[PDB]
Amino acid sequence: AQHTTIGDVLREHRRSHPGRTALVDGPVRLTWPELDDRVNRLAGSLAASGIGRGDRIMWLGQNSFRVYELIAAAGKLGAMVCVGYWRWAPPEMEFALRDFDPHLVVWQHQEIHETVARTREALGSDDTARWLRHDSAPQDPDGYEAFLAAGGLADPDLDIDPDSPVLVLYTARQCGSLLSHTNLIAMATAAAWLGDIDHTTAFLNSGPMFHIGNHQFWGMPTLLMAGKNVIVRRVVAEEVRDLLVAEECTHAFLMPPTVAEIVRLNRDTGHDLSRLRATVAPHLWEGMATTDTSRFTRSGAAAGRGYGQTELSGFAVTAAYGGPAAGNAGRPGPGLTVRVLDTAGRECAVGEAGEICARGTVVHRGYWNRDEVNAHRFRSGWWHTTDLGRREPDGSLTFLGTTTRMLKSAAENIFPAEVENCIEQHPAVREAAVIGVPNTRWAQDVKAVVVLEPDAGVSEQEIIDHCRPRIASYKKPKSVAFAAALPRTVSGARDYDALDKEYGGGGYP
Amino acid sequence: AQHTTIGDVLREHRRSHPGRTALVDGPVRLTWPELDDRVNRLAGSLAASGIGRGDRIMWLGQNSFRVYELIAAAGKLGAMVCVGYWRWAPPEMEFALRDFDPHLVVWQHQEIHETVARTREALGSDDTARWLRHDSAPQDPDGYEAFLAAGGLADPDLDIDPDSPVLVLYTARQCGSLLSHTNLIAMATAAAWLGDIDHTTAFLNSGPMFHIGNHQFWGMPTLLMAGKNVIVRRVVAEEVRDLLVAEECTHAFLMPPTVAEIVRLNRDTGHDLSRLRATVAPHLWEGMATTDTSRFTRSGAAAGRGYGQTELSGFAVTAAYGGPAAGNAGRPGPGLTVRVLDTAGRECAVGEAGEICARGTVVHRGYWNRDEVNAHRFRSGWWHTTDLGRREPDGSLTFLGTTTRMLKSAAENIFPAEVENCIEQHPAVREAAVIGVPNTRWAQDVKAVVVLEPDAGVSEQEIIDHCRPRIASYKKPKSVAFAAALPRTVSGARDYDALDKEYGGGGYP
Incomplete structure (x- = not known):
């Protein structure tokens, strides 16, 4: 009642932003009410199939608007979604399926069907999950869309605890980091401040959703602020350039090699990319995009002046928080406290290297199915990152390595x-x-x-x-x-x- | 471990900002480590006197830096502070003391001593609280400073639940609204986005701390972002002007009549008020202060385009969230969902007036000692504001009255x-x-x-x-x-x- 969940975000947006476009993916376009409607049908079908609080759904595919739908549907039931690595070979896919033990798997046939079939055969008689093909024919009875269409429009309307995990991301021995509704909203809120994100943001989702990056900058803050999330399946410079123009994107996840490819294609074409606020390698755009002037870019954070990991809901310490910093990582954002602890669990002196430890709202809930590792990594009520760092005399932090x-x-x-x-x-x-x-x-x-x-x-x-x-x-x-x-x-x-x-x-x- | 409290804010600032000034009040100046040290001593003395989780402290005075100290110390113990109305006459002061039933009262002799003595006389044999005079001689054994100086430097280090109340503000039949650590931090976080607040913010605390306003805009966000809070006891145009210059204030709580006093006073003196970012009645400053260009001002929110109340941790719905709005109040900020409910508890149609109801992170914990009113005003899992409003076709909200x-x-x-x-x-x-x-x-x-x-x-x-x-x-x-x-x-x-x-x-x- 006094606690926001991902479900609450969508319920508010359907009321406050009835006409705004929420998601675009190829020819699919959804307003906030249309998205929330689909989320409800999907949640309805999930619940009828037995999915509830603590239950688990695995996604095996490239980026898709359906990832957002599943996260929100799962979230309304208090269930969780793992966005798996679509490139996993059969041994790693099998390991992840056995570890995470999903009740439902939503898989992609394009590009990876052979690996998927091999893995299901490898699981043999342990392959008991329901499998729904997401890129199916729309009437495919083993497909996502037909499963969703059989659900009703009513909101499930459950009291979901926001500390319960909703997104699970595997990190490298692979371990599934459990991110709660609270983790994601605290991350998105902090990111909206960093990047000056609002309802006019239009973000091209060109980073992999199996990593935290695309969610942080700027998938989730865009969603939180009711902006528009545009999805692409793969990164092909021509297609990205066309989407940047046609959707009037203000932000996108584009690394320097892709930037230079785009720039070469676009040279002397007159296609207008000036709406894009370039955060990474602004100079490489050669004036074709606007250089971002948000704190994220101005501070050097976007060029790597910070520290984080999945388990801290991403890049949680940056030079954007708290001014000039002698240390290469800056300072913790709000809702994070950081101590550098020695081997005995005591706080290191200024200048002394030790393990970066954290408490606060962006600290994940632990790894899935790792009771021992979790007991050890949370010892003395601090999350232990396994990253080494030190505090500088000015109060800022330096990240040294693992x-x-x-x-x-x-x-x-x-x-x-x-x-x-x-x-x-x-x-x-x-x-x-x-x-x-x-x-x-x-x-x-x-x-x-x-x-x-x-x-x-x-x-x-x-x-x-x-x-x-x-x-x-x-x-x-x-x-x-x-x-x-x-x-x-x-x-x-x-x-x-x-x-x-x-x-x-x-x-x- | 995964939840920030007000205590965690100070522990982090003492480490990340060792040299920055946190509070200024007359000749008193405190860096973050100096403030946190005082807070720890104060918490030490509070705990030794028996104050712990759920206990209560009443402040009966004008604005002071000690209010922040008390809120933080109380918060490290899971206790709460009521900032009472210093102008209360004896009947109302008695009412509040009997209602809130504080274990400790921190009172001010200047201006209100007669009222205080009359009230304690009126309480008769029910006056069992400890009373500490805040504006005492420093060695006064019944004074705040001697009580604090007897505490040790160690941080109490308790695991405090952030949903527990920490600030209590009386709202007019008077009722004490209970604001948790979470409520205040969510309010401060949203305010930091609204007003572009950071570690360089210097806010003059010239609004009354018995009301949520001064805390929202901008006491608490400034504290959260590690900026500097400057305190004044009362609002005298000349003193405010000298503080704005001497402390290089970027923000202040100044209503139009006070603004025009200051302006006339400063005309052709060459005293430089340009650092001040005027949010309210910027035109009235006549170019002496910079007109604020944060979203708060640009959107009209600072001129009144929004809706809120103490029980929503202040101005929680504004024209700054979600773009142009046909309705006079705009849209809810993040961590707030709003529904307009009819007399039967059902959601009103577009255009239909009903009661503004809310769920989310800024919703207070209830009123102190009002079991029936709380059961009724939280019925069906929504907080009922007793304010009347409607949704417009564009999705925005209009506030009509009570x-x-x-x-x-x-x-x-x-x-x-x-x-x-x-x-x-x-x-x-x-x-x-x-x-x-x-x-x-x-x-x-x-x-x-x-x-x-x-x-x-x-x-x-x-x-x-x-x-x-x-x-x-x-x-x-x-x-x-x-x-x-x-x-x-x-x-x-x-x-x-x-x-x-x-x-x-x-x-x-």
């Missing part, structure tokens, strides 16, 4: 990320990776693999002496190797296993 | 405020009051008392026939009396008893 990589050299635990960050402050260094190499007396020594800027020179020694004045002696590398670039995985992440193989790594705890 | 004035003509309940609003739409009418006059057959007939614009003419019949096309026939006035202005009370409120006396009113239900 705590999940660790060296143990004799008695001492050493966090590579701390040493990496230290070496990366040298102006001659582009990037550094730190590994441990065996030492028969005390398990490990520290080794750095360093990638220099092309126009700079430093030696093994200058980089060791560079470490002396701000990291503890026992953390300095015993040797430095120089490389043209770091090895990376097919996904473009640092390849630590390949580092260990090339440079003699081992002896880890 | 439902507490009612006529009953034969079988029909008639709301004077609906008829008043209708008559006030005529361009020749400045203001209209509607009363009931006795009718021996069916109890009451409708009568209008109408105040014309100085430059217009209309007759009794124009005004009756004016009503025909909107309101129902039985609601039209049977007679109209014209008046030079409406009688008002010493507080400047409409004087309905004097209307009844003058124009033969009676026969009410």
Whole structure:
């Protein structure tokens, strides 16, 4: 009664914004009343099929307007939706289905049908969920639309606890982070402030919904403020350009490579993209889009000056909160308190690296089906991020890296990320990776693999002496190797296993 | 763990903003760590004196920085503070003390000591609270400062439920509206979006803290965003002008008569008030202050285009939410859903007047010690405002007046405020009051008392026939009396008893 849920957002919008367009996806266009009507029918069918409080629905597909519908329908029943990774190969898909154990699976035939069939065959006699094909013929009795059309118009009208999860997002051993109605609304509210979002926002949903990013910037704040969410299935520069114009989009999730592709296509065509408020790499648009002047962009937050993770409902610490910041992440937004805690659970001094810990409204509810990990990661009433950081003297925060990589050299635990960050402050260094190499007396020594800027020179020694004045002696590398670039995985992440193989790594705890 | 309280705000600010000024009150200046330290000491002494979850503290004084300290200290203990009306005469002060039944009273000697002594005398042997004089000599053992100085620096560190009340404000039969941590933070968060408030905001607290206004715009959002709150005890034009300059205030609570005093006082002095962002009557500043360009001002909300009450944590419906609005109040802010309900609890159609009802995060917890009224005003899971309104076709809302004035003509309940609003739409009418006059057959007939614009003419019949096309026939006035202005009370409120006396009113239900 004194607590807003996602259901409450739609019920209010259908009354306050009867004529406004809420969702667009290909030829589908829905006003707030039309969306809320569909949500009600869908919730009606879900309830008749036995879905209620705590029940679970998995989405296996690319972006679609139906993801918003399911989140809201589920939300009106106190159920939850996992937006799964559509690229999962059969082993990972099987693992996610077995872990999350959905009562219903809404799947996409286009692009992934072979993987889906293989996975269902792999599940064998454990495949007991209902499966609804979302991109079906509209009359397909095993399809989403026919399931929805059999529902009635009445609102279920249940008292749903807003702390109950509604969106589940898998994060990398994969774990499902449980985001409540409260988490999402606090995130969206904070984001509306950051980005100056309102009912005139028109956001192109070109980021993956299996990640928190697209929801934060700006799927959910647009929904909260009654603006227009335009969906695209894949990112094809020509199609994106046409949607930016035809839907008069003010915001979109567009990374630099896609930006440059769009810009090249649009050069000298006269198609007008000036309504778009570019947050990422504004300069690359070459004046074709307007540079965003919201706090999000002006502060540097949009260029990466912040810290977050799914479990904090996204990018929850930024340089937009609280002014100039010495630390690379800025400060926590409202509804978040952050402490840097040492190994004993005590608060670190200024300058000292420790684990970033959090309390507040954007902290998730835990992982799905991880009782032990949850008990441990919430110990002493703080959420433990497994990310390493420090407070600066001005009060702001620096994010250093993960705590999940660790060296143990004799008695001492050493966090590579701390040493990496230290070496990366040298102006001659582009990037550094730190590994441990065996030492028969005390398990490990520290080794750095360093990638220099092309126009700079430093030696093994200058980089060791560079470490002396701000990291503890026992953390300095015993040797430095120089490389043209770091090895990376097919996904473009640092390849630590390949580092260990090339440079003699081992002896880890 | 996943819920922010007022205590969490200060704990975070002490870490993120170690050098910023939080409060200024005369010579008192407090950074966030200094404020949080005082709060902790104060909480220490409160707890040692027995104050804990659900306990109550009454403030009987003018504005002071200690009000923020008390609210925060109380909040760290799960206790609550009533900011009482310092002008209460002894009967009303006694009523409030007996009703709220505080364990502790923090009182002011200046200006009101005689009233306070009379009231304590009146309470006789029921005066069992601790009384602490806030404006005492610093060492006064019955004073606030000595009580606080005896507390230790440690943070009490309790797990406080944010739905628990922390601020209590009396609303006129007086009733104490209970505002939770959540209510205040949701109000402050929405206000920060409305007014573009951040850590650089410096707000002069020149509105009375016994009313929600000063808290909403902009005491609490400023606190939330870590800006600077400057306190003044009373509003003297010269002192306000000097504080606006010396503290470089960006915002202040200043009504038009005070604005014109300040303006005349400052004319050709060269004192620079340009940092001030005028929200109310910006034209009246004559270029000496900057006209605010936040949504709050641009939308008309600051000039009165909205609707709210204490029990909705203030001005909760405004023209700033959701764009142009045909209705005089706009639309609900996020975390608020509004329905116009008829007498039977059913939702009114578009255009039909009924009671404004609300669910959501800004809805208060109820009144203190009003079990029956609370059960009734929360019936069917909606908070009932006792304010009358309607939805317009565009989805926006119109506020018509109160439902507490009612006529009953034969079988029909008639709301004077609906008829008043209708008559006030005529361009020749400045203001209209509607009363009931006795009718021996069916109890009451409708009568209008109408105040014309100085430059217009209309007759009794124009005004009756004016009503025909909107309101129902039985609601039209049977007679109209014209008046030079409406009688008002010493507080400047409409004087309905004097209307009844003058124009033969009676026969009410």
